[PDB]
Amino acid sequence: SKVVVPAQGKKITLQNGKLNVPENPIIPYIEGDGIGVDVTPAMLKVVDAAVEKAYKGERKISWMEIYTGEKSTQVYGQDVWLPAETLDLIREYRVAIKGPLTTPVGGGIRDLNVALRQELDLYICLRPVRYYQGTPSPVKHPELTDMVIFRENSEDIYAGIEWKADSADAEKVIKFLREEMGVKKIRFPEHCGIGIKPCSEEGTKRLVRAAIEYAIANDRDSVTLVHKGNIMKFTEGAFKDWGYQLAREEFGGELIDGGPWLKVKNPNTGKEIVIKDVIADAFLQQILLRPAEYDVIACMNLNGDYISDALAAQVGGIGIAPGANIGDECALFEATHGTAPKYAGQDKVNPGSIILSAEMMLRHMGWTEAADLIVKGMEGAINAKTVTYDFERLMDGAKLLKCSEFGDAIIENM
Amino acid sequence: SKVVVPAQGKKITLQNGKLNVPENPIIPYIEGDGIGVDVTPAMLKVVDAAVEKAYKGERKISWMEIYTGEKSTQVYGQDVWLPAETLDLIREYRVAIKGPLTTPVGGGIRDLNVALRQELDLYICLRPVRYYQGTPSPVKHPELTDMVIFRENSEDIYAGIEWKADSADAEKVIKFLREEMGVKKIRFPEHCGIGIKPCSEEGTKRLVRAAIEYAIANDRDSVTLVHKGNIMKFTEGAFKDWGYQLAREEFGGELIDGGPWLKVKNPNTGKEIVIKDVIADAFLQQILLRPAEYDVIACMNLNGDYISDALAAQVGGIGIAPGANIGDECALFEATHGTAPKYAGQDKVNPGSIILSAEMMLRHMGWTEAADLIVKGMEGAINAKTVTYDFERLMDGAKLLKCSEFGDAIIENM
């Protein structure tokens, strides 16, 4: 209705689990707020370039701008931050990609990135972090990190089930909890806010199954379940138990030693994947001290968030971290950083993040060659020290490029 | 009743907020399980040595063993993990110190360290992490870190208010939430575990007040409130708002720029402390990339846990991190690491942690000279590369000492 669907271009179809991608698919993209206006032109350019090179003119993406965030209020009228047709169109066109989004305060509105996740039930937040040779890093050995994060998107304290201190609602559930449930452990029942943390069996096993299948599909060496289960027995504890249970029941897992850990034999390469767990506060330490011991990670919503952020800073890629949100019916790839208004429009921020989320998009579509050319580009650009401001401030002897130019530096290294 | 109170020795008295320490105070200590049997002899020895040197024979601690954990079942009978008189005796004798504690599984028992915290309402978990020149570190610049963590101990998802997936209890509160509260955001109401996260006003302002008073008492440059408030508005959001509010209302805070941040003028040195906040996932990144920007930190229970663990690994001090739990009526200092059974009794683990928690104990008692000698010792021992196994594996050219001997290496450098 305000989106214009492209005249040339065909829809990706879902033929029972499998994507059936046409050679000219229509891909919805949400430009993003703030620096979205800078990073997204770069991405459309380096992806067009990479598919123009990969298939020598045969395949072409018909990009179709859909709207969310702040720009959506400028297109549909100041009150609509998330159009009902964005949800329909992502659902319909099957894969989309987006820039950073702004949720306003003062409006009673919850996180629009999280709204997209839950409203489209894109229950897998996949966060691949690896080191790219050359990026300035805070740590002595960033090349040791090559992990893939399977963060559960649909439950946990991120669902947003909460009530205000002094509201009637809060008053009511604290009353229920103390009176009917008999809780004595709320230290100050007056002027107290309550949040609800749900973890379900169907919730963790659809994530873990994703995680282990990824490890087989790519011969990763293990799957670590990270949780804060010693303290949060019935949710985090639950998550680990149900995760282990699935590796045993659906993937034939067997105990190594006298447990806890399991072995899963990869039905394609013969190699054994270790299913193991580590408590989430110690894990924060283990990724810094022993990173090469960890590889595919599976975790609930909140931890997954903290872990991915932490991992991305260690390897120097806070501005180049990619992300995908994946469900059973459509997928959403995304720049994993903020809108950075201070700089918006100055063509100067790094477009790494959203570009690499676009090679994940490309890979997901089976356009392996195109995706492989973007990471070919990235490594080359980075390695050529032909970098954008944020990496140049920390490198000695690099060439400062603008955003669009790092775009071009990626196509020149392809 | 099974504890033997020392014949010589006088109780510390609390004269309205102020401690009145006698020159021969009785200090309860809990030996600890696992390597508690190794680390605690070292600590009693290096503290006796440091007070023997500081006051030249005038002052002496009368150590009194009280019992919790596994050893408590061997003293009071296999069922009692936490004796009611440990709580009375810590309450009574005012400051105690402990080793690592074991909570069993299969018993329905919750975390005994957390039980001590809540049962004695030691609502401040203070975690000072700094770099000690010489410790092997995973990061390029560990000397940039000198932060003090004020982690709230009595509320949040750590209270332990939770119910099992498929229990009647869980069934009941999910029913209440969906039916009476009208929640539509629990993705899978069947086979779902529920945890309760409470944050109260009285809860956050008694922690924040502790934090800001610490910054004035020691001229620290700022207090960062870290929270996950953009997503958890009514608890984390609440915590930040109430924290800012207290800096304004009780400490005269004024906006820097057009806010959010505040300035508090230290009423003793004239310097302005900045009260600021950062969202907890980005903070995990900021401590790695810009650590010198952060100093006194104030946060809820769970984050505080993850932050302190993360900070301690960056500065190389996972085995030498100290901790105190402080309330309005008694204090509990502690080795912040596990019982490490694999090694228990082999006299080989690092006793850094509990020793440094003992200089915090000593400082808290006003025995500044003795405390200053332990950190004098530590720096010297570490710097002499006369180290225990865990630091020696990572140093080139160090001397491997046993646990007791690192004890002695600390007294030799005093």
Curated annotation (Swiss-Prot), chains A, B:
GO terms for biological process: electron transport chain; glyoxylate cycle; response to oxidative stress; tricarboxylic acid cycle. One of its GO terms (molecular function) is magnesium ion binding. Changing Y158F: Nearly abolishes enzyme activity. No significant effect on substrate affinity. Inhibition of this enzyme by phosphorylation regulates the branch point between the Krebs cycle and the glyoxylate bypass, which is an alternate route that accumulates carbon for biosynthesis when acetate is the sole carbon source for growth. Phosphorylation state of this enzyme is controlled by isocitrate dehydrogenase kinase/phosphatase (AceK). Signal peptide: none annotated. Pfam families: Iso_dh. Gene3D superfamilies: Isopropylmalate Dehydrogenase. Optimum pH is 7-9. Exhibits maximum stability at pH 6. Binds 1 Mg(2+) or Mn(2+) ion per subunit. Both Mn(2+) and Mg(2+) can be used, but Mn(2+) is 10-fold more effective than Mg(2+) in vitro at the same concentration. It catalyses: D-threo-isocitrate + NADP(+) = 2-oxoglutarate + CO2 + NADPH. Mn(2+) binds at D305, D309. Its cofactor is Mg(2+); Mn(2+). Mg(2+) binds at D305. The modification Phosphoserine is found at D111. Its EC number is 1.1.1.42. InterPro entries: IsoCit/isopropylmalate_DH_CS (IPR019818), Isocitrate_DH_NADP_dimer_prok (IPR004439), IsoPropMal-DH-like_dom (IPR024084). Keywords: Acetylation, Glyoxylate bypass, Magnesium, Manganese, Metal-binding, NADP, Oxidoreductase, Phosphoprotein, Tricarboxylic acid cycle. Catalyzes the oxidative decarboxylation of isocitrate to 2-oxoglutarate and carbon dioxide with the concomitant reduction of NADP(+). PANTHER family: ISOCITRATE DEHYDROGENASE [NADP] (PTHR43504:SF1). Belongs to the isocitrate and isopropylmalate dehydrogenases family. This is Isocitrate dehydrogenase [NADP]. It comes from Escherichia coli (strain K12). The lineage of its organism: Bacteria, Pseudomonadati, Pseudomonadota, Gammaproteobacteria, Enterobacterales. The gene is icd.
